[PDB]
Ligand binder design. Structure first.
Ligand SMILES: [Cl-]
Ligand SMILES: [Cl-]
Length: 162
């Protein structure tokens, strides 16, 4: 959808399907990151094919972040496939270290206390800053369904949220 550099909900330079380029306030710094990611002089604009390539890599990266993380892996391993997509969604948005910080929520999720996990996940900066997205992800954790995305797989889910 967005094939030119934009800022994300935190004001950070981004392109494509939520591909964060840099936290630097320099648009030139962001353009340099873009060119390095794409492998050419893009001047701040990419193709659809390029956007989808970065997206595939970014999803892979989020899965790899979980599997390499001592706190996230055992939660991920305990979840069914639909709830695993909710966890990948969080990591995609906030990064592995950020999600690994939800210690209490992760525990509740591992215990399969879905309603209590949902309540705990909402007492977060995440929820207060991106409540509609957070509500969709949380409903996914609570129900183990894709109901919140009705009007599926992790790629489609992120295409919707991002
Ligand atoms: Cl992202
Ligand atoms: Cl709580």
């Amino acid at each position: 959808l967005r094939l030119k550099i934009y800022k994300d909900t935190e004001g950070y330079y981004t392109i494509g399907i939520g591909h964060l380029l840099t936290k630097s306030p320099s648009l030139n710094a962001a353009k340099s990151e873009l060119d390095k990611a794409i492998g050419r002089n893009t001047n701040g604009v990419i193709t659809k094919d390029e956007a989808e390539k970065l997206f595939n890599q970014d999803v892979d990266a989020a899965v790899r972040g979980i599997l390499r993380n001592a706190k996230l892996k055992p939660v991920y391993d305990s979840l069914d496939a639909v709830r695993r997509a909710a966890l990948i969604n969080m990591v995609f948005q906030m990064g592995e270290t950020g999600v690994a910080g939800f210690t209490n929520s992760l525990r509740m999720l591992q215990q399969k206390r879905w309603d209590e996990a949902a309540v705990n996940l909402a007492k977060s900066r995440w929820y207060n800053q991106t409540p509609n997205r957070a509500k969709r992800v949380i409903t996914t954790f609570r129900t183990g369904t894709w109901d919140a995305y009705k009007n599926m797989d992790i790629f489609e889910m992120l295409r919707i949220d991002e």
